[PDB]
Design a protein around this ligand. Structure first.
Ligand SMILES: *[C@]1(C(=O)NCc2ccccc2)O[C@@H]1C(=O)N[C@H](C(=O)N1CCC[C@H]1C(=O)OCc1ccccc1)[C@@H](C)CC
Length: 251
């Protein structure tokens, strides 16, 4: 395996890999890390381009994935993709796809022109219909995964999975010092535990002798490094290597 790897550069024909979304004021990271990686993989393994609906995942999976805006389980999300499939849907107010995200973008621990995020967010309804004007129907717009699996807490195997099949979803413990991340390789040194956070890992590298994972957060582009961040790799730091999940699209 190479010393560095950036899925964005390795699969130039898959622009979703470069995208950063905004989960808004809702604890839907579990759903976002999943639909983002799934969007990447659908393009990688059939290179069609589809903005997989975070709304569909967030609202229709139900208990199997956890508790909507109150948090969920990454592996459960990929299961939903294989069992019920996922329709298309872009950013809030984009009118792109069957079910665009219904929760407004906000400022995540940074100042900006958008309203500041306010944790309190209610899970939107599971509506099995597409926005007006969109074709085909909800049922016909479903994209299915043909496998849902968990990658071992093994640096090499995780790198190998990304290298071969594309970005994966992972999760780590968020402590307050992470909230102010701007650049460099993040290592937890201070701050209270905020809870588990699911994200999309799309590569790795070494910065100043420090091995890291290239990660895409779901807090818009004005947070962190253009929406992305790097975190220490190789020591299961904050559990970043403990809950990796992925899957392959059908056909
Ligand atoms: C991830 C998130 O979205 N964080 C940012 C945010 C923005 C706005 C408002 C709140 C939070 O809280 C999100 C998530 O999916 N969390 C998820 C989680 O904490 N839980 C899922 C089910 C209930 C809850 C929990 O307490 O889980 C503990 C747990 C851990 C392992 C096995 C079983 C249960 C975590 C798991 C995502 C990795």
């Amino acid at each position: 395996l190479p010393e560095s790897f950036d899925a964005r550069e390795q699969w130039p024909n898959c622009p979703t890999i470069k995208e950063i979304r905004d989960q808004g004021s809702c604890g839907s990271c579990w759903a976002f890390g999943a639909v983002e990686a799934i969007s990447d993989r659908i393009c990688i393994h059939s290179n069609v381009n589809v903005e997989v609906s975070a709304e569909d995942m967030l609202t229709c999976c139900g208990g199997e994935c956890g508790d909507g805006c109150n948090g969920g389980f990454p592996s459960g999300a990929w299961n939903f993709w294989t069992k019920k499939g996922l329709v298309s849907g872009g950013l809030y107010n984009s009118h792109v796809g069957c079910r665009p995200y219904s929760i407004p973008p906000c400022e995540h621990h940074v100042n900006g022109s958008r309203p500041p995020c306010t944790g309190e967010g209610d899970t939107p309804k599971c509506s099995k219909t597409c926005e007006p004007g969109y074709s085909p129907s909800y049922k016909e717009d479903k994209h299915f995964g043909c496998s849902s699996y968990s990658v071992a807490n093994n640096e090499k195997e995780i790198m190998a999975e990304i290298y071969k099949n594309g970005p994966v979803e992972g999760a780590f413990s968020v402590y307050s010092d992470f909230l102010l991340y701007k650049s460099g390789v993040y290592q937890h040194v201070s701050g209270e535990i905020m809870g588990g956070h699911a994200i999309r890992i799309l590569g790795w590298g070494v910065e100043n002798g420090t091995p890291y994972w290239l990660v895409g957060n779901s807090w818009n582009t004005d947070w962190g490094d253009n929406g992305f961040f790097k975190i220490l790799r190789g020591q299961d730091h904050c559990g970043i290597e403990s809950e990796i999940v992925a899957g392959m699209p059908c056909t």
